[PDB]
Amino acid sequence: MRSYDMNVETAAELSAVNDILASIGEPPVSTLEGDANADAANARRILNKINRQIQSRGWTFNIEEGITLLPDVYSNLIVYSDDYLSLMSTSGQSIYVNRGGYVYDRTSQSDRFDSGITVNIIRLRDYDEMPECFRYWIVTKASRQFNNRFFGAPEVEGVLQEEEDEARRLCMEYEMDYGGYNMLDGDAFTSGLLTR
Amino acid sequence: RSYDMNVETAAELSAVNDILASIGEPPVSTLEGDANADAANARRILNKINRQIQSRGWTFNIEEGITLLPDVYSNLIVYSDDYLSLMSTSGQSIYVNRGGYVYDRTSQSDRFDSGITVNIIRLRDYDEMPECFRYWIVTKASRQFNNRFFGAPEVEGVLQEEEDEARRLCMEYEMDYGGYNMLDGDAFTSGLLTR
Amino acid sequence: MRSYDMNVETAAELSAVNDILASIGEPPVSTLEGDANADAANARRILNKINRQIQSRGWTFNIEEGITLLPDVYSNLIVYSDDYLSLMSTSGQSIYVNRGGYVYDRTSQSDRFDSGITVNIIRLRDYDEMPECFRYWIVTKASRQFNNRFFGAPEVEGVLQEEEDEARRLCMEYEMDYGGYNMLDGDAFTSGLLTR
Amino acid sequence: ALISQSIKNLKGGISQQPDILRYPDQGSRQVNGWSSETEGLQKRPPLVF
Amino acid sequence: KKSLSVARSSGGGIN
Amino acid sequence: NVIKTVLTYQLDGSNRDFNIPFEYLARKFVVVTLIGVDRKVLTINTDYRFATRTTISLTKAWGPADGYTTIELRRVTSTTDRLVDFTDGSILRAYDLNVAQIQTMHVAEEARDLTTDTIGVNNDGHLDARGRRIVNLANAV
Amino acid sequence: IKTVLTYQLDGSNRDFNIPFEYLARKFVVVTLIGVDRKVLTINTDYRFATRTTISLTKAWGPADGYTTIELRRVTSTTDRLVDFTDGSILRAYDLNVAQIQTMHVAEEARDLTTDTIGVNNDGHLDARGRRIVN
Amino acid sequence: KTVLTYQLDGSNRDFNIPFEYLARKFVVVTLIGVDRKVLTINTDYRFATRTTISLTKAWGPADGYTTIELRRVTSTTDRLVDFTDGSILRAYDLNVAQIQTMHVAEEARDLTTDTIGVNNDGHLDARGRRIVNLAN
Amino acid sequence: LNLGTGQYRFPVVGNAKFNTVYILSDETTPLNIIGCGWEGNYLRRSSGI
């Protein structure tokens, strides 16, 4: 699992932590560097957890289709990193699993590949790389979980529950607008049916 | 007071004072000094709410057909943090943020010979918002200020009612501004109307 | 934003503030001039806020259609004042936005105008210039918001909520009586359809 | 139901009564400890040769 | 709202 | 760069209402002049009116037939005469402090907007004369 | 000492010093000067690396069309950082900021010579290759 | 007006100051000869009165410096009035605080007008100087 | 002389256990602090029992 606290702090990640801290009424911190602030460290840990969780759900912007994963030429192993939030086949039933940290073909019962495999993959991205709406939902969900675990205020719980639903709705609107999905001509099956 | 004066006040200081008033607190005369937690907290929420409402997408702030030019040497287009939404002009969008740069996921390339044309939402100032939108931002900013820094639940019931009214008036502004028509303004039906 | 504190106090504005003060049981003030009265200053701030908000909604009496905004001959800039509560096109989709305090044509991506532009505009008006019904609604809404923020009495909340609903209804009755709208011959589309 | 009690000062030394009879500030054992009025339980001062 | 700890001045010695 | 105290509008001969975008403390601080062959200053109540605090209504419509291509709305805040003077016995008030600050601010703004009374760069990369003659240039070589 | 100063642009450099004092970051205006003038935006085109320096997100130069960058202080006159409210504690910080902000506008007022023709060594009026209109 | 000149070939030291100055460091006295000479205060001129300066030495057109310029340069960075909490707010200090900004503004109204200005006829009055390097 | 009488409300934000509030004054004016007070959001997940 990628370390969230071992790199430089971005302006957005620092802003995200301060937003999470505000949810229970904690004042903002100037830096994310360790100052023995348990609340900020807790907020950043939940921020990372929510960041991985929403990204792993799968969206048009972060689902990479047709990606080639290359094996090592002398070991024929393809690594299945913990940053692979989802690894799928491009079509049909998926055949690749995680076995010992390496890609495993469950149908052929082999972890050895002479050439790259083509997979539909979700790879973990920085919270800075998320769209603005998705950043808001991550912060809203992280703030809700932060308050539930470390303060538990029921009034804050109710409002943050509403905010997450609104934040997820706006991410749902982003997904469709980005997706541009059409059931007539953008459809896998129906588009062939429209040829006269 | 003598004279028929015509003077203005800063809208951000007014917005913060409305956020402070929502929790019953006295207004502040200034918003700088970095030693006032209330000023810092209200301003952070007001910026956060202003940023969040603009990112939802409206006819007035969704800029269509905007060209982003690459660097002449690195051929990289910066994906700004102030790009609240970046989409293709039509169809499925193909550009994502990868390390602070525009990335074409379909072609798997950060490099662009010429400028790309995108449907972009770029962050604007609170002063550049329409009056109804400014009211909605302040109402929403006041509501999240009470939840985070006041906590009174009867104020939440009041501000929830005010935000819902604040949002509908902005939705009225959206429809009046858009002037959308499903007969001739429609992308598809207008073609069907030709005889 | 137009200053509400910096001009002569009018009888109606003074009456409005004392009405707002009465909502929480405060006695009337003789003048709106600064006497360190925090309640009166708070009431006048909410009064101005509600005055801007109801006017920005848009009504037949305050929506100015076909107004020409003239540019500066040497800079070709049309100022978009903060007192422009709403700025639209006369017909169809609007093309003008606020960019840096000046009118900006988002379709042509220019802020330079060689001649005046015709816009459907709402301009801020004094609380004096509001119709009597609209003055009552502004005061009722300001009184409700004043009590919510500075006293919080729940019994006062319920009654002022009902008073605002009645106040808004009577402003809607004024809107239709002033508007005189007809769907047969006053309609943009149907009136053309009525010709034989 | 979750319940919680705090013992403000461990200033009562030890007690040899059954635990159901003891005060919250009295423990079972206290060796080489100092019961300060304002600093709580401390180690006894070191023995200086 | 969970109940508060009862203010106990308590005491010492044998009980 | 762009001047905010001097607003000049084209005169069409039929429009009599012109917008005041800038702030002002007194209507005397607003100066209305018609520009053309000459610069004629207008009087407060006989040549124009303050229809609203942001609108000036001319009594008569002026245009090129009258010899005036443009009308100028310019703020000229008093420098010698201050609107607020504090005394030893006076209660300090928010309005007095605001007016004192704003008046000095207007005087500072008008000095920074004095490129109107000189040759300064306009929005484009061109030095602007703003419709007046460069007199006494005399011989050229 | 100057509230307006210009740096020549090369593709190598991205950091430019702010010598003057500004009350707000929005008071600093960054512009690209070439055949066309382009005002930059606070976050997409540059940033405040420190209190005294501006770092551009993208390098610029003659290839892009801009040979010089401009850092100018434009203190807001309409939007005042201090507005005294009735019934509020009169703080000396408010009075100092109100006095400083109007001073910055007056300080920029005496730097208009840059945006003017200028005078030659011979004492003539030297337009730096600029047309005179109206 | 914030800038004045006096040309006096004969033996004279006194020059009346037209403008109001808040501090003596604001008034700067220079000698307009072939090249301008900036004069320090103690060595060259004493303030015989708040209104007048007694410039030591004749400094007449016998020397190249001929006329003498009295220029007001108010310091923007330095504030003569700095408000402090716990100090009696004085009507004098409130008044002077605004004046220092106004004096800077007054000096600005003359610096820009110096190179080229507008006359009483509302026209840009040139001093008889050709518009060189002008682009068509 | 500028002497104030009344109440001054100021934000003290966050955990009460980690908020240090102190009053400094080195001016020649007098100060007469009558009293103080605080408000905050309190929650415990267990009962006092």
Tab-separated table of all heavy atoms in Angstrom, chain H residues 27-62:
chain	number	residue	atom	x	y	z
H	27	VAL	N	11.444	67.554	1.974
H	27	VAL	CA	11.949	68.589	1.079
H	27	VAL	C	13.351	68.220	0.622
H	27	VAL	O	14.249	67.984	1.441
H	27	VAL	CB	11.936	69.959	1.770
H	27	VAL	CG1	12.325	71.049	0.782
H	27	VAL	CG2	10.572	70.239	2.357
H	28	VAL	N	13.548	68.172	-0.691
H	28	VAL	CA	14.850	67.904	-1.287
H	28	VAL	C	15.246	69.115	-2.121
H	28	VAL	O	14.428	69.652	-2.878
H	28	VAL	CB	14.846	66.607	-2.121
H	28	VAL	CG1	13.927	66.717	-3.325
H	28	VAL	CG2	16.257	66.252	-2.556
H	29	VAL	N	16.481	69.573	-1.942
H	29	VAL	CA	16.993	70.766	-2.603
H	29	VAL	C	18.126	70.350	-3.526
H	29	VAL	O	19.089	69.708	-3.087
H	29	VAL	CB	17.467	71.815	-1.582
H	29	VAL	CG1	17.780	73.124	-2.275
H	29	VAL	CG2	16.415	72.017	-0.504
H	30	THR	N	18.015	70.714	-4.801
H	30	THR	CA	19.002	70.346	-5.801
H	30	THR	C	19.422	71.576	-6.592
H	30	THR	O	18.747	72.609	-6.586
H	30	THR	CB	18.471	69.265	-6.754
H	30	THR	OG1	19.541	68.782	-7.575
H	30	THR	CG2	17.381	69.832	-7.643
H	31	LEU	N	20.559	71.452	-7.270
H	31	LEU	CA	21.142	72.525	-8.063
H	31	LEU	C	21.082	72.149	-9.537
H	31	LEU	O	21.700	71.165	-9.953
H	31	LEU	CB	22.589	72.780	-7.641
H	31	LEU	CG	22.826	73.538	-6.334
H	31	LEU	CD1	24.296	73.496	-5.962
H	31	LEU	CD2	22.346	74.970	-6.452
H	32	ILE	N	20.347	72.934	-10.324
H	32	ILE	CA	20.134	72.618	-11.733
H	32	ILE	C	21.194	73.289	-12.597
H	32	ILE	O	20.976	74.382	-13.131
H	32	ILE	CB	18.720	73.028	-12.185
H	32	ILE	CG1	17.669	72.460	-11.233
H	32	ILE	CG2	18.449	72.540	-13.600
H	32	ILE	CD1	16.294	73.049	-11.428
H	33	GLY	N	22.338	72.639	-12.751
H	33	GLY	CA	23.415	73.120	-13.603
H	33	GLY	C	23.547	72.297	-14.865
H	33	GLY	O	22.553	71.859	-15.452
H	34	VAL	N	24.793	72.095	-15.299
H	34	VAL	CA	25.044	71.158	-16.391
H	34	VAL	C	24.626	69.753	-15.979
H	34	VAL	O	24.048	68.999	-16.772
H	34	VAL	CB	26.520	71.225	-16.833
H	34	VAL	CG1	27.459	70.922	-15.672
H	34	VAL	CG2	26.773	70.274	-17.994
H	35	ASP	N	24.898	69.384	-14.729
H	35	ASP	CA	24.372	68.173	-14.122
H	35	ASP	C	23.835	68.534	-12.746
H	35	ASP	O	24.410	69.369	-12.042
H	35	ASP	CB	25.440	67.077	-14.011
H	35	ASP	CG	24.874	65.760	-13.516
H	35	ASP	OD1	24.192	65.071	-14.303
H	35	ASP	OD2	25.107	65.416	-12.339
H	36	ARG	N	22.725	67.908	-12.370
H	36	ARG	CA	22.080	68.247	-11.111
H	36	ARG	C	22.907	67.773	-9.922
H	36	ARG	O	23.486	66.682	-9.929
H	36	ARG	CB	20.676	67.647	-11.045
H	36	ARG	CG	19.750	68.103	-12.160
H	36	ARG	CD	18.819	66.984	-12.596
H	36	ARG	NE	18.134	66.372	-11.464
H	36	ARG	CZ	17.156	66.944	-10.775
H	36	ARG	NH1	16.706	68.151	-11.082
H	36	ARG	NH2	16.611	66.288	-9.755
H	37	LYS	N	22.959	68.614	-8.893
H	37	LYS	CA	23.654	68.312	-7.648
H	37	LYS	C	22.631	68.232	-6.523
H	37	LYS	O	21.900	69.196	-6.277
H	37	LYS	CB	24.705	69.376	-7.334
H	37	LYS	CG	25.899	68.862	-6.547
H	37	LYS	CD	27.031	69.877	-6.538
H	37	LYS	CE	28.152	69.448	-5.603
H	37	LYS	NZ	27.810	69.699	-4.177
H	38	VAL	N	22.589	67.094	-5.840
H	38	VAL	CA	21.713	66.911	-4.688
H	38	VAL	C	22.484	67.316	-3.440
H	38	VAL	O	23.592	66.825	-3.197
H	38	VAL	CB	21.212	65.463	-4.590
H	38	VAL	CG1	20.264	65.314	-3.413
H	38	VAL	CG2	20.530	65.051	-5.883
H	39	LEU	N	21.900	68.210	-2.647
H	39	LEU	CA	22.586	68.829	-1.521
H	39	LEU	C	22.087	68.239	-0.209
H	39	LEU	O	20.875	68.136	0.011
H	39	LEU	CB	22.375	70.345	-1.525
H	39	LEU	CG	23.359	71.221	-2.306
H	39	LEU	CD1	23.556	70.717	-3.726
H	39	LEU	CD2	22.894	72.669	-2.310
H	40	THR	N	23.022	67.859	0.659
H	40	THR	CA	22.665	67.434	2.004
H	40	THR	C	22.168	68.627	2.814
H	40	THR	O	22.414	69.784	2.470
H	40	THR	CB	23.858	66.786	2.706
H	40	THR	OG1	24.915	67.745	2.839
H	40	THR	CG2	24.360	65.593	1.909
H	41	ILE	N	21.458	68.334	3.904
H	41	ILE	CA	20.765	69.392	4.632
H	41	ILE	C	21.737	70.184	5.502
H	41	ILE	O	21.863	71.403	5.358
H	41	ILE	CB	19.593	68.809	5.448
H	41	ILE	CG1	18.936	69.903	6.294
H	41	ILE	CG2	20.029	67.602	6.280
H	41	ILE	CD1	17.734	69.432	7.072
H	42	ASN	N	22.461	69.504	6.395
H	42	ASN	CA	23.256	70.214	7.395
H	42	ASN	C	24.342	71.066	6.751
H	42	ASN	O	24.598	72.194	7.189
H	42	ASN	CB	23.874	69.219	8.378
H	42	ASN	CG	22.879	68.720	9.403
H	42	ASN	OD1	21.720	69.136	9.416
H	42	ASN	ND2	23.328	67.823	10.272
H	43	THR	N	24.991	70.547	5.709
H	43	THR	CA	26.123	71.254	5.122
H	43	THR	C	25.675	72.439	4.275
H	43	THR	O	26.387	73.445	4.184
H	43	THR	CB	26.960	70.291	4.282
H	43	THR	OG1	26.149	69.737	3.240
H	43	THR	CG2	27.502	69.164	5.147
H	44	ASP	N	24.500	72.346	3.647
H	44	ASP	CA	24.149	73.268	2.577
H	44	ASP	C	22.982	74.199	2.876
H	44	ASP	O	22.969	75.319	2.354
H	44	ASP	CB	23.838	72.488	1.293
H	44	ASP	CG	25.058	71.787	0.736
H	44	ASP	OD1	25.951	72.481	0.207
H	44	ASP	OD2	25.128	70.544	0.831
H	45	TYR	N	22.004	73.784	3.676
H	45	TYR	CA	20.853	74.651	3.887
H	45	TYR	C	20.235	74.383	5.250
H	45	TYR	O	20.057	73.236	5.662
H	45	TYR	CB	19.805	74.471	2.783
H	45	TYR	CG	19.330	73.050	2.583
H	45	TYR	CD1	18.164	72.596	3.187
H	45	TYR	CD2	20.041	72.165	1.785
H	45	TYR	CE1	17.726	71.301	3.007
H	45	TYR	CE2	19.608	70.868	1.598
H	45	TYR	CZ	18.452	70.441	2.211
H	45	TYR	OH	18.018	69.149	2.026
H	46	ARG	N	19.880	75.467	5.930
H	46	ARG	CA	19.219	75.386	7.222
H	46	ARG	C	17.802	75.918	7.079
H	46	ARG	O	17.525	76.801	6.264
H	46	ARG	CB	19.973	76.174	8.304
H	46	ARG	CG	21.430	75.777	8.493
H	46	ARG	CD	21.634	74.275	8.385
H	46	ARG	NE	22.741	73.813	9.214
H	46	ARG	CZ	22.660	73.591	10.519
H	46	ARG	NH1	21.530	73.775	11.182
H	46	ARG	NH2	23.739	73.172	11.174
H	47	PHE	N	16.898	75.362	7.879
H	47	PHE	CA	15.513	75.814	7.912
H	47	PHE	C	15.418	76.987	8.880
H	47	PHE	O	15.130	76.799	10.067
H	47	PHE	CB	14.578	74.678	8.321
H	47	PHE	CG	14.299	73.696	7.220
H	47	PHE	CD1	15.281	72.823	6.785
H	47	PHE	CD2	13.055	73.650	6.616
H	47	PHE	CE1	15.026	71.921	5.771
H	47	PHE	CE2	12.794	72.751	5.602
H	47	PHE	CZ	13.781	71.885	5.179
H	48	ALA	N	15.669	78.196	8.371
H	48	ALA	CA	15.563	79.387	9.208
H	48	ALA	C	14.158	79.533	9.773
H	48	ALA	O	13.974	80.026	10.892
H	48	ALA	CB	15.951	80.629	8.406
H	49	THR	N	13.155	79.110	9.009
H	49	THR	CA	11.778	79.076	9.468
H	49	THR	C	11.100	77.915	8.752
H	49	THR	O	11.628	77.373	7.779
H	49	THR	CB	11.063	80.410	9.202
H	49	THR	OG1	11.930	81.495	9.555
H	49	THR	CG2	9.793	80.528	10.038
H	50	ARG	N	9.932	77.516	9.257
H	50	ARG	CA	9.178	76.448	8.606
H	50	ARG	C	8.842	76.808	7.162
H	50	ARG	O	8.667	75.922	6.319
H	50	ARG	CB	7.904	76.147	9.397
H	50	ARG	CG	7.220	74.845	9.005
H	50	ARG	CD	8.015	73.633	9.458
H	50	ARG	NE	7.982	73.459	10.905
H	50	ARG	CZ	7.200	72.593	11.535
H	50	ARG	NH1	6.366	71.808	10.873
H	50	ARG	NH2	7.257	72.512	12.861
H	51	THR	N	8.760	78.105	6.858
H	51	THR	CA	8.339	78.526	5.525
H	51	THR	C	9.525	78.695	4.578
H	51	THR	O	9.376	78.538	3.362
H	51	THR	CB	7.546	79.828	5.612
H	51	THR	OG1	8.287	80.791	6.371
H	51	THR	CG2	6.198	79.589	6.276
H	52	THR	N	10.701	79.031	5.102
H	52	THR	CA	11.825	79.434	4.266
H	52	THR	C	13.067	78.605	4.560
H	52	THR	O	13.276	78.152	5.689
H	52	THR	CB	12.143	80.923	4.452
H	52	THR	OG1	13.295	81.270	3.673
H	52	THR	CG2	12.407	81.242	5.913
H	53	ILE	N	13.889	78.415	3.531
H	53	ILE	CA	15.169	77.722	3.633
H	53	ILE	C	16.276	78.715	3.313
H	53	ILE	O	16.221	79.409	2.291
H	53	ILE	CB	15.240	76.508	2.694
H	53	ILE	CG1	14.256	75.426	3.133
H	53	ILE	CG2	16.649	75.960	2.637
H	53	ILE	CD1	14.102	74.305	2.131
H	54	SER	N	17.281	78.780	4.183
H	54	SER	CA	18.451	79.627	3.979
H	54	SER	C	19.594	78.750	3.479
H	54	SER	O	20.353	78.191	4.277
H	54	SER	CB	18.831	80.350	5.268
H	54	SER	OG	17.797	81.224	5.683
H	55	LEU	N	19.714	78.636	2.160
H	55	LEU	CA	20.752	77.817	1.546
H	55	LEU	C	22.107	78.483	1.740
H	55	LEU	O	22.330	79.593	1.249
H	55	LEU	CB	20.461	77.625	0.060
H	55	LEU	CG	21.285	76.586	-0.705
H	55	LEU	CD1	20.664	75.203	-0.609
H	55	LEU	CD2	21.452	77.004	-2.157
H	56	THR	N	23.009	77.809	2.449
H	56	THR	CA	24.350	78.346	2.636
H	56	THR	C	25.052	78.468	1.291
H	56	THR	O	24.776	77.703	0.362
H	56	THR	CB	25.163	77.457	3.579
H	56	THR	OG1	25.576	76.272	2.886
H	56	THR	CG2	24.334	77.068	4.794
H	57	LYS	N	25.930	79.472	1.183
H	57	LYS	CA	26.678	79.794	-0.032
H	57	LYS	C	25.768	80.460	-1.055
H	57	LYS	O	24.553	80.246	-1.046
H	57	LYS	CB	27.346	78.551	-0.631
H	57	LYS	CG	28.594	78.843	-1.448
H	57	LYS	CD	29.327	77.562	-1.819
H	57	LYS	CE	29.368	76.587	-0.654
H	57	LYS	NZ	30.047	75.314	-1.023
H	58	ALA	N	26.347	81.281	-1.935
H	58	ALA	CA	25.545	81.977	-2.934
H	58	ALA	C	24.966	81.005	-3.955
H	58	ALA	O	23.763	81.039	-4.245
H	58	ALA	CB	26.387	83.048	-3.627
H	59	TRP	N	25.806	80.126	-4.505
H	59	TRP	CA	25.394	79.151	-5.518
H	59	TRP	C	24.709	79.831	-6.702
H	59	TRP	O	23.707	79.342	-7.228
H	59	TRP	CB	24.485	78.076	-4.918
H	59	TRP	CG	25.195	77.088	-4.046
H	59	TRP	CD1	24.980	76.868	-2.718
H	59	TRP	CD2	26.224	76.172	-4.441
H	59	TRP	NE1	25.813	75.878	-2.260
H	59	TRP	CE2	26.587	75.434	-3.299
H	59	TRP	CE3	26.874	75.907	-5.650
H	59	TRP	CZ2	27.572	74.449	-3.327
H	59	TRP	CZ3	27.851	74.930	-5.676
H	59	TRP	CH2	28.189	74.213	-4.523
H	60	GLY	N	25.255	80.966	-7.130
H	60	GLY	CA	24.645	81.738	-8.183
H	60	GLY	C	25.038	81.255	-9.562
H	60	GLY	O	25.919	80.401	-9.741
H	61	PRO	N	24.353	81.800	-10.572
H	61	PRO	CA	24.749	81.540	-11.966
H	61	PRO	C	26.213	81.812	-12.275
H	61	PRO	O	26.662	81.469	-13.376
H	61	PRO	CB	23.830	82.476	-12.761
H	61	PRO	CG	22.606	82.640	-11.891
H	61	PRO	CD	22.947	82.220	-10.478
H	62	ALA	N	26.971	82.424	-11.361
H	62	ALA	CA	28.421	82.434	-11.514
H	62	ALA	C	28.961	81.010	-11.560
H	62	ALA	O	29.813	80.684	-12.396
H	62	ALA	CB	29.069	83.225	-10.378
